């Protein structure tokens, strides 16, 4: 229904906005693009579901997110992939791991602040109906 | 967070170490303690921010340094104060000015040698987040 489609259009505008804010933060630059298959040929062999912010934008435009909870599922993935791939004690890994949690925490905190629970609740129920 | 506090604890151990090395150098003995308000009553009237190595130790223990860049700010201060206060052509001033620059140069060169840039970079980003 047109009313349902408009609900999801509003969600999409919001998710693009949140993602664009994450993507312009200098700390998160490493998470903005997919890992280059050459530079890191072993990335594919350790991470089963690569995720990054430009992919997240593709999925938005492909109507793949019907809730915020589904969006955050992918943000968590970005964080959890970075933690898995870069687990070492050395400072360079610590920096990436903090940057990864900072990205996650930031996304949640924006949503906690700006999302109407009833709008999210509506999105969820349209989704269950499908 | 515990992880953040541990980052800053590592910084503090390092800064104490660097400062203790500066403080045991005979050249730098004059910079180890605050200017005695009686011996030099006019020190307060010309220098706006007194600084010395034992004060630097106090600030470390008071969690006042979150980066190395903030520590070096105070080392620069020690140097610049000595240059302001003792500007004369006479050899006794030259010696103090030379020791002051030697202290600064030494502190920077230790840091350049021993500090991981990614550790410092992490410290900076935790600081910006606060």
């Amino acid at each position: 229904s047109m009313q349902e489609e408009d609900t999801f259009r509003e969600l999409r505008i919001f998710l693009r906005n949140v993602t664009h804010r994450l993507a312009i933060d200098k700390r998160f630059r490493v998470f903005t693009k997919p890992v280059d298959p050459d530079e890191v040929p072993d990335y594919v062999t350790v991470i089963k579901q690569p995720m990054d912010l430009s992919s997240v934008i593709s999925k938005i435009d492909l109507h793949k997110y019907l809730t915020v909870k589904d969006y955050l599922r992918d943000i968590d993935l970005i964080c959890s992939n970075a933690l898995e791939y870069n687990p070492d004690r050395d400072p360079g890994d610590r920096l990436i791991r903090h940057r990864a949690c900072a990205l996650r925490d930031t996304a949640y905190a924006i949503i906690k602040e700006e999302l109407d629970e009833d709008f999210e609740q509506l999105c969820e129920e349209i989704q269950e109906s499908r | 967070s515990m992880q953040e506090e541990d980052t800053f604890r590592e910084l503090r151990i390092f800064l104490r170490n660097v400062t203790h090395r500066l403080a045991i150098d005979k050249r730098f003995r004059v910079f180890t303690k605050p200017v005695d308000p009686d011996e030099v009553p006019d020190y307060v009237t010309v220098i706006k921010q007194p600084m010395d190595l034992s004060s630097v130790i106090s600030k470390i223990d008071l969690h006042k340094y979150l980066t190395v860049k903030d520590y070096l700010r105070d080392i620069d201060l020690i140097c610049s104060n000595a240059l302001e206060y003792n500007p004369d052509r006479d050899p006794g001033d030259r010696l103090i000015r030379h020791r002051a620059c030697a202290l600064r140069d030494t502190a920077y060169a230790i840091i350049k040698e021993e500090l991981d840039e990614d550790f410092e970079q992490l410290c900076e980003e935790i600081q910006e987040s606060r």
């Binding site: 925490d105 930031t106 996304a107 949640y108 924006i110 906690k112 602040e113 | 606060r130």
Partner: peptide, 5 residues
């Protein structure tokens, strides 16, 4: 908001 980290 969300800009402190």
């Amino acid at each position: 908001s969300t800009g402190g980290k």
